[PDB]
């Protein structure tokens, strides 16, 4: 223990050295490890140094032959900021004959504490006694931090590869060896960690990171190994920690992460206990046991499978897909109340005239309606009575057989009763007018100013390039004429930054939805004919048969077909039907959810893209269904159709006679 007095001696002298030392400016003196690594002398992948395989011992260790420890393994990434080296157990009693403190590697005295310890301050003390170090540029909170991570690392390097890292790891000489190391990496060659950059507002972009989970349970805290900040997981992560996947002490890899409560700079040490970072599930995927805390090489965001996307949070930073399908533009409308409405072009041009027409009549009807608001016993005892009340005095002059010839038969007070019920009538009219205007004019300015809320959308059916698939949907709002012609079916792109994968709808929860935001970019990558055919099934114009065999889900149910119309039918009560017959005199029906595209008159070559199967097939009376994404045509130029049509254009340019009629007989009987 010592007579406990030879310690301040060692301390006042320790304290003096620093004293003088910081009283100046001097020449740098890179530490042991900094001058080593700093050169050539071949390095050694933290991997290679272990044959490649994470841990190699479990339970109570295969044994503590080589070298383990107690009060060292029973330690955490939240208490290493305290460890405390029992000065007594690492030098023994042979070096303890020295009550002037233990001199240490790199130059610089680490003086045990009265209490027999060697904690934070001790090292902060030494690290200041350390040659080539200016104690003005470091400080207790600085060493603190680092004394934490520089430990947990070593410690951890213990219960893990006991066979290659004895205790030749946690000695107080690799701690003061590293603390010096960091002071070289960061205070000398002034190289800044990943989070120190970010926090200090010098790279912020939360671009591809490799961090590590520390404290956890509303939010957790990640680290780059040097400094640490409190992240902000989204619901789906909130679940992966509450379930136990993000195991404090593991490496992940976020992408577009970001900051909240982040005014400007600040040194990660004076880190506002408010500010937080925002990891986002879809843009985070665990990283190997080894890696490299900090920013990562390929600055280019990493892709991944839709199959793996979630929905309670995050945008995907990148997705490597193939444009399976491509639908026609939709002219959506947001109803004054709630709910959104979808309309083809033909429909949002019909509706666009049906409105701006109606509600342009209302704008005049307000005025057409205000335009139509402009243009017995002796008459002597009588004239005296019907003179008192002015109200009846007026009356008595209007419904008067004779005009101003009667009011000249009374020139008294009762001629000032009429002329007082006269001018009160004007300031009654003049009131309505003035008001009746305004009242209207003001209700039209409340008319003419209301408009339909219409924007447009483009849906694409895409699938991850990486085998199998989960063809989800990509919606692109107000698609620039460019975008529109760049994306084509059966191609590859790497779309980056796609809308917060908003969940789909209609029945169950499989698959997901993609929307592109203003910061999405489309990079078209190539594909080999030879390796396309796995995922990408081109558009095919069925030979009509398929709809028969209980084995041909035919791509998400959509089919495109060709044929001739036998007869239209518009069932009283809405829900038209169109009977088409192909070349093998096969029949099916198209139920119309929209409006007949004109040309669909009985017996005409009709092509059609985008039709959905309906239940109960296998009955000669198939049942396709025309929705919003349906196209139709009397003269399709498209490929896949070209054949199957020349084919059906055959029995029309062949018999042409007993054909259409027989079909009629075919269909006529099935009824």
């Amino acid at each position: 223990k010592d007579l406990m007095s030879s310690l301040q001696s060692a301390r006042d002298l320790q304290d003096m050295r620093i004293k003088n030392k910081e009283r100046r400016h001097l020449r740098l003196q890179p530490g042991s490890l900094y001058l080593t690594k700093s050169s050539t002398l071949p390095r050694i992948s933290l991997q290679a140094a272990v044959g490649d395989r994470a841990p190699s011992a479990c339970s109570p260790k295969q044994l503590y032959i080589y070298g383990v420890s107690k009060e060292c393994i029973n330690v955490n990434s939240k208490n290493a900021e305290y460890f405390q080296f029992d000065i007594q157990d690492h030098f023994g009693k042979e070096d303890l004959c020295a009550g002037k403190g233990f001199q240490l590697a790199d130059g610089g005295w680490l003086i045990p504490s009265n209490d027999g310890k060697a904690g934070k301050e001790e090292f902060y003390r030494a690290l200041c006694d350390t040659p080539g170090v200016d104690p003005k540029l470091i400080s207790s909170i600085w060493v603190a931090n680092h004394y934490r991570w520089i430990v947990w690392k070593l410690a951890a390097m213990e219960f893990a590869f006991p066979k290659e890292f004895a205790n030749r790891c946690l000695n107080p000489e690799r701690v003061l060896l590293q603390l010096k190391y960091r002071y070289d990496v960061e205070i000398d060659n002034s190289r800044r960690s990943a989070l120190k950059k970010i926090l200090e507002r010098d790279d912020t972009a939360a671009k591809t990171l490799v961090l590590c989970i520390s404290d956890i349970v509303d939010t957790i805290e990640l680290t780059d190994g040097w400094y640490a900040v409190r992240a902000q997981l989204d619901p789906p992560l909130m679940a992966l920690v509450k379930s136990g996947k993000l195991t404090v002490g593991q490496k992940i890899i976020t992408q577009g992460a970001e900051l909240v409560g982040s005014p400007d700079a600040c040194a990660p040490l004076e880190a506002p206990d408010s500010l937080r970072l925002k990891i986002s599930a879809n843009s985070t995927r665990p990283a190997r046991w080894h890696s490299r805390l900090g920013f990562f090489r390929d600055p280019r965001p990493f892709p991944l499978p839709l199959s793996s996307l979630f929905s309670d949070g995050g945008n995907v930073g990148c997705v490597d897909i193939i444009v399976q399908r491509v639908y026609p533009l939709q002219w959506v409308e947001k109803t004054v109340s709630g709910l959104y409405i979808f309309r083809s072009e033909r429909e949002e041009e019909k509706e666009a005239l049906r409105f701006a027409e109606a509600q342009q009549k209302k704008l005049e009807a307000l005025f057409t309606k205000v335009h139509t608001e402009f243009k017995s016993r002796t008459l002597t005892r009588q004239q005296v009575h019907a003179l008192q009340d002015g109200a009846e005095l007026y009356a008595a002059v209007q419904y008067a057989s004779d005009p101003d010839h009667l009011e000249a038969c009374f020139s008294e007070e009762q001629l000032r009763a009429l002329n007082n019920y006269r001018q009160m009538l004007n300031d009654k009219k003049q009131a309505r007018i003035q008001s009746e205007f305004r009242k209207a004019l003001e209700s039209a300015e409340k008319e003419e100013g209301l408009s339909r809320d219409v924007t447009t959308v483009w849906k694409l059916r895409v699938t991850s390039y990486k085998k199998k698939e989960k063809s989800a949907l990509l919606s692109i709002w107000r698609p620039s004429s460019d975008l529109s012609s760049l994306l084509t079916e059966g191609k590859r792109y790497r779309i980056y930054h796609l809308a917060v994968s908003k969940s789909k709808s209609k029945f169950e929860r499989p698959s997901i939805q993609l929307t592109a935001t203003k910061r999405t970019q489309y990079q078209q990558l190539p594909v080999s004919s030879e390796t396309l055919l796995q995922v990408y099934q081109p558009r095919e114009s069925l030979h009509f048969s398929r709809l028969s065999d209980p084995a041909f889900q035919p791509p998400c149910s959509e089919v495109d077909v060709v044929g001739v119309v036998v007869s239209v039918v518009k069932p009283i009560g809405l829900a038209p039907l169109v009977y088409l017959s192909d070349e093998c005199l096969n029949l099916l029906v198209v139920k119309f959810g929209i409006d007949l595209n004109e040309d669909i008159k009985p017996r005409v070559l009709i092509a059609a893209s985008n039709l959905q199967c309906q239940p109960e097939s296998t009955s000669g009376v198939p049942t396709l269904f025309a929705g919003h994404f349906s196209i139709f045509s009397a003269s399709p130029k498209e490929a896949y159709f070209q054949e199957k049509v020349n084919n059906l254009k055959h029995a029309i340019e062949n018999i042409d006679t007993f054909y259409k009629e027989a079909e009629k007989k075919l269909i006529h009987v099935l009824e």
Binding site: R43, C212, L293, S307
Partner: protein, 42 residues
Amino acid sequence: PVDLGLLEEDDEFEEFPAEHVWEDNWDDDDFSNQLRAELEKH
């Protein structure tokens, strides 16, 4: 003997990024055995 002073250690960061790795679906070897979480397991 592995000269630590030579070991390309875990936290030796690369400031200038512009001088396999991540696994697709979150939960499905290397993402199991973390050289740092175990001291948490015991």
